[PDB]
Amino acid sequence: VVYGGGAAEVTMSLAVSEEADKQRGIDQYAFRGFAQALDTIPMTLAENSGLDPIGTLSTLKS
Amino acid sequence: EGVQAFIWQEFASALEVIPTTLAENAGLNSIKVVTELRSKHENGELND
Known part of the structure; x- marks a missing residue:
């Protein structure tokens, strides 16, 4: 069981960016790409609902 | 702090x-090259 509604995407996204800060290597941008790719589904819901995407993801991330 | x-x-x-x-x-x-651009520019203000 897991609570969806865009929560599963953002909660898996911020941890990947946190791991990249110490697991930099050559694949530092690879984790950042997957972190930004997971957040697109909340932004997709923002477009269909007609809300501001940046304000939505900024509030959820904060 | 704005869009x-x-x-x-x-x-x-x-x-x-x-x-x-x-x-x-x-x-x-x-x-690797761009990482050196970031590593040398905080001290080197120009001609780097």
Whole structure:
């Protein structure tokens, strides 16, 4: 069981960016790409609902 | 702290393509070269 509604995407996204800060290597941008790719589904819901995407993801991330 | 600032971040990120293109034409790894551009510029203000 897991609570969806865009929560599963953002909660898996911020941890990947946190791991990249110490697991930099050559694949530092690879984790950042997957972190930004997971957040697109909340932004997709923002477009269909007609809300501001940046304000939505900024509030959820904060 | 505005949406105009978020566009300026992409303005700064997209402007780094010129040394990235130089790395690919020279065969050097772009991330290793661009990582040195970030490491030397906080002290070196110009001519680096």
